[PDB]
Write a protein that binds this ligand. Structure first.
Ligand SMILES: O=C(O)CNC(=O)C(=O)O
Ligand SMILES: [Mg+2]
Ligand code: NI
Ligand SMILES: [Zn+2]
Length: 331
């Protein structure tokens, strides 16, 4: 079995190897990359996502989210308070303000210590989930706006044509902005490209050990657990590396820098934070290996998790028994 300790793998494809996206994913899996839940891909040195980032300031963040925490430093929830619209240029100035900017630090490890010690005492503002793309249309390799769609994968594997579309999303972050512990909708893959700015630190649990994280989360968030049988789908809960280590949960960590891709694999729980002002682009995708994970994915039916139009068809075709109750949650 390749990668039996489920370490995060880092890949350096040549420009020749960067032509065929599906084939490279399948290569990474042949080497065991999926067992970690997360992989890093450093693009060939010849490749670029676009020529410059000089003209992005007039992108609108229609609903910036202030991430307010409750709990203790290593075990907390966050809720998202909606703020007034602002442009990317306005958001960048805010991120660089004395109130919100990254503190002085020695290295990524010292910054990580400061994040876990102090996150709960501040409410950073995240420009998340903005439909759009920063890839130049002439970028032909690993362009997240040009990938094969999950609806077309389901049709190719299963023979059933379904409605729905699959487009990317932009994330504009600042110091302390936080992504809570989750897997993707329908336990899909994700791919994330850090276009610009400061790094993003990731934590991940190997897919084969995901249920250990779920059982800890039920213990640590006991009211949330009684409210919903899949409450990590709400994307609100944080658990620190120190707490995970104290409870014996297997995980790994890695920092992504500008210019690098990360891939999350089906049923790979992940969480993380931004080091400063940055912009990332991400999308879900599928391969033939995903289909069995899609059939088994948990679902929120309490009504909190409220997801896309396109997830309807996935539930309807892959999980017909759940269909009914899940759509009651979505309506
Ligand atoms: O970058 C973020 O805030 C969150 N991204 C992801 O969870 C992802 O790409 O799967
Ligand atoms: Mg602009
Ligand atoms: Ni994710
Ligand atoms: Zn729920």
């Amino acid at each position: 079995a390749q990668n039996p300790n489920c370490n995060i793998m880092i890949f350096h494809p040549t420009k020749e190897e960067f032509n065929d996206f599906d084939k490279y994913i399948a290569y990474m899996e042949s080497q065991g990359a999926h067992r970690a839940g997360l992989a890093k891909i450093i693009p060939p040195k010849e490749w670029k996502a676009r020529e410059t980032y000089d003209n992005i300031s007039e992108i609108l963040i229609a609903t910036p989210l202030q991430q307010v925490a409750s709990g203790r430093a290593g075990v907390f929830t966050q809720y998202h308070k909606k703020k007034k619209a602002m442009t990317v240029g306005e958001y960048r100035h805010l991120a660089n303000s004395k109130k919100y900017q990254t503190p002085p630090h020695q290295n990524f490890e010292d910054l990580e210590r400061k994040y876990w010690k102090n996150r709960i005492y501040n409410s950073p503002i995240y420009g998340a989930d903005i439909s759009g793309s920063l890839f130049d249309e002439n970028t032909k390799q690993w362009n997240l706006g040009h990938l094969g769609t999950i609806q077309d994968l389901l049709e190719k594997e299963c023979g059933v044509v379904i409605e729905g579309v699959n487009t990317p999303y932009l994330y504009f972050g600042m110091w302390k902005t936080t992504f809570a512990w989750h897997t993707e909708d329908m336990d899909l893959y994700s791919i994330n490209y850090l276009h610009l700015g400061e790094p993003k630190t990731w934590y991940v649990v190997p897919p084969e050990h995901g249920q250990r994280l779920e059982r800890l989360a039920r213990e640590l968030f006991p009211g949330s657990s009684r409210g919903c049988g899949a409450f990590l789908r709400h994307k609100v809960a944080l658990i620190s590396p120190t707490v995970l280590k104290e409870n014996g949960i297997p995980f790994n960590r890695i920092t992504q820098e500008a210019g690098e891709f990360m891939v999350t694999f089906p049923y790979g729980y992940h969480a993380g934070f931004n080091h400063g002002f940055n912009c990332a682009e991400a999308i879900n995708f599928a391969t033939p290996r995903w289909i069995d994970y899609g059939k088994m994915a948990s679902q929120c039916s309490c009504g909190e998790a409220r997801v896309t139009f396109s997830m309807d068809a996935f539930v309807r075709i892959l999980q017909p028994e759940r269909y009914d109750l899940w759509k009651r949650g979505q309506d």
